[PDB]
Amino acid sequence: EVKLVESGGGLVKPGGSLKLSCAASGFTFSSYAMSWVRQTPEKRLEWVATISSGGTYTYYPDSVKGRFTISRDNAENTLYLQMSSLRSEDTAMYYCVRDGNSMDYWGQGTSVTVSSAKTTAPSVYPLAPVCTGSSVTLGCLVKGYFPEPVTLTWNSGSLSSGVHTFPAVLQSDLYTLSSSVTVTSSTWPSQSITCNVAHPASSTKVDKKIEPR
Amino acid sequence: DIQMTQTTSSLSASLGDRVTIICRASQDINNYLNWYQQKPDGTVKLLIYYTSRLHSGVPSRFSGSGSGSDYSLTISNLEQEDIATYFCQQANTLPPTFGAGTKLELRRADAAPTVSIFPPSSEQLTSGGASVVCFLNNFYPKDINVKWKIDGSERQNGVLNSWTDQDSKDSTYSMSSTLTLTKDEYERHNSYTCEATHKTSTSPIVKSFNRN
Amino acid sequence: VECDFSPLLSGTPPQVYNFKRLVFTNCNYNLTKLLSLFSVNDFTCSQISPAAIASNCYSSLILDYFSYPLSMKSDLSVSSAGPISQFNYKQSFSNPTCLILATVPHNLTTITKPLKYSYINKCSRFLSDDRTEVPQLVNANQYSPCVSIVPSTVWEDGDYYRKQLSPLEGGGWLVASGSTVAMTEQLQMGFGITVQYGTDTNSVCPKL
Ligand SMILES: *[C@@H]1O[C@H](CO)[C@@H](O)[C@H](O)[C@H]1NC(C)=O
């Protein structure tokens, strides 16, 4: 089973450096060309680099030439992307990819943000209904964090149905995220519903229980 | 560099239908054309390589056809799991370049938004902020307009909106609208209204509260 | 009305296994016009002569061009046992053919160089038991079955490329092996010419 697991993503200042890694398994790594591909927040895909199976040849687009270096370690089965002289346009999700005549297998990607802005932990606010029907909707407001991402769950993930977690919105330096959950009236408030938010960049974990107002 | 043009950016179809996504290259790319599917959770898979060859594990209802600079991806007997964005990619010369992708949407019966409005949490008010949140959930089609009113007066400034992709289980759309004020600015008004304009009704769907 | 060889003169030529094929019908050709833009190193023909091919009428004329290196010229003959004739390019025995080996002059800036010469050293289909190998030899005029698994350029010399075949295709694998040759100072190319016959149209004639 082919597996590609990227790591090394984060927030870096403009003009800064960052090195990404990719742990490959489930195939003979040294038999394949490997590639990096990035996707902008606007969902546009752009090839970043390809390295030949033996590491002999490397190829880059002009947008990254001279700044990025792809490399591999065939003994350790890992692919690397050294980035330097970073610009904010380099902000993207970076995917490790198995190449050849096509990009066979894609990793799940690792997020990179290039910004002067500082890491900010979010405020998490429980949204209870206004002071009734056959269902109730609860909400969660994740406000003022940077950078992406956050992870949001309801009751530690056991409550997945009726959930709508909305794409984060950037307003200036800070991100805002919201999530709603809709359950039957007999479910809440008689049963406990809690919002769970994690912001790894700021090492933040918050549980916020929805209480009736 | 070779430009890949996917002529439609969004496509709408029904289950069992036959969908055809077309890709144009700015040059003859000699069949070195590949197709990728990205699901809403971001997962990317290879579907077709070299114009028409099917990648292993990909169902036979996916197929490819084309030559020169004109290429097509076809999905027959459209299923629910096919809600995705589909990208073409040329592999003839470097750099390999991708199309901007084609989003595929499933059709369903018309559905009205479920609207819920939320006053600021007392915890936020304590910190001096005041966000008024409104959810407009599970509606179809995706086209919708949201208006905020404070004491009958329309308000546009300080509103952040967010939209979800099509729900993979019931094919509906949802959106979030947040009006942010300071606590002081908030406490200067009484009535806060969230209004939804949607095909399913002539008059707007309205949710409101008073600071009392 | 004049047969258009322009696609040859613009861009990077392909390799020997993914050669570009031009098919000419209902037009007038000037072969001397084309060959004068190049430095012709070899020109041979079978079942016809270099002078005759340039002054006759046919139902169609087929021109194959690709990046090929002179060092390897012996391998292009149909009496080679080498990888080139077995797995990359074989001309028609039944019809009259011409094989031209030429060099792109420095003046011909419009044709751009590949990074290197690439070819398939072997192409095989392995059975479902991943043990039994069925070599895939090129037929005259046909592309290798492995063009669908080999990139438009071999990434590195000695690379293996493979793809699984679906149960409908009988399962198993299609496996190819690639080789490279260092790029020369001026681009060296190969041209293959084939002519076809028909009773209706002989509308491919030399321009007069
Ligand atoms: C090519 O053939 C044309 C006739 O169509 C002739 O006018 C011209 O002189 C020829 N070119 C050369 C290189 O002689």
Author numbering:
A (entry chain A): 1 to 52, 52A, 53 to 82, 82A, 82B, 82C, 83 to 99, 101 to 128, ...
B (entry chain B): 1 to 212
C (entry chain R): 381 to 588
Passage from the reporting paper:
The England1 strain (GenBank ID: AFY13307) was chosen on the basis of the availability of its sequence and its proximity to a consensus among published sequences, particularly within the RBD. The final round of hybridoma screening generated 45 subclones, four of which (D12, F11, G2 and G4) were selected for additional characterization on the basis of their binding specificity and neutralization potency.
To provide an atomic-level understanding of neutralizing activity, the D12 antibody was crystallized as an Fab in complex with the England1 RBD. Vaccine-induced mAb D12 binds to the DPP4-interacting region of the viral Spike RBD, blocking receptor binding. RBD residues W535 and E536, which bind to the conserved glycan on DPP4, are bound by the CDR H2 and CDR H3 within the D12 paratope.
